[PDB]
Ligand binder design. Sequence first.
Ligand SMILES: *CCC(=O)N1CCC[C@@H](n2nc(I)c3c(N)ncnc32)C1
Length: 276
Amino acid sequence: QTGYLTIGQRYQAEINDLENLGEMGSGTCGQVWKMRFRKTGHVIAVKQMRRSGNKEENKRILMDLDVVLKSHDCPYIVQCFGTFITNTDVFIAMELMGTCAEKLKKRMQGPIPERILGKMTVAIVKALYYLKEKHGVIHRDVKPSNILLDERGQIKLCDFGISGRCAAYMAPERIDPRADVWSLGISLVELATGQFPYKNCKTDFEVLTKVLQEEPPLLPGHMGFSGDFQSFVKDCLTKDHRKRPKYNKLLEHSFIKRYETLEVDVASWFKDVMAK
Ligand SMILES: *CCC(=O)N1CCC[C@@H](n2nc(I)c3c(N)ncnc32)C1
């Protein structure tokens, strides 16, 4: 299905029906434009895959789109609104999110509150569990840059270009043969403290050295972090991949079950951080 913008209202449109409002971010999977649908006025994100582009980058863009299209019923994965195939380019209409957790960390200039990380943990775990269960997909790259938030308070994963069936969030069993949840724990410690636990390393291999040699970077106990938060991170940061719990066990954690029911005002916190 190409030439349709299903933003529950499907519009038979082309690429010329979108106004280019500038590029968002840089690099990563592909060139993402901020575009406005001239027919309705809605603003969406548009990935552009050039037919003449890098064959390795285009291979990841097509793999990401394959996962995104398969996940049209996962609330914690960015939805595709349609595609436009021309003789020169492929335009992938994605829903517009605010920013990634990495940029939230830089604009916050400090720790992100636990109540925000709780709603984020529930979203990312269910996203990874959805990719494993309904599709057999392993993310293989969970990082704050892959955790998007929006003005309404939604939290979703975005980049599946290297998934299958960066090195600083890599699990111990990936370096030396549930690896996606070690990356989630490293991301949680980073966002909960504002400091990356391996910022002292100067090379990629030195991070791999610290991951295997040093003890897991646990949460500090003097920042008011609840016991459920510290327990969930410790379970994620289990070095032996056999002792590390599966997704059906992590989804039953008290830290997960608490923020499934709790009402956290992520939307208001998001706009106040964006205004800083
Ligand atoms: C931290 C996020 C980031 O820098 N980045 C790279 C540039 C594109 C950006 N992004 N990718 C997608 I797919 C987006 C959607 N759907 N909305 C907003 N921004 C998006 C991710």
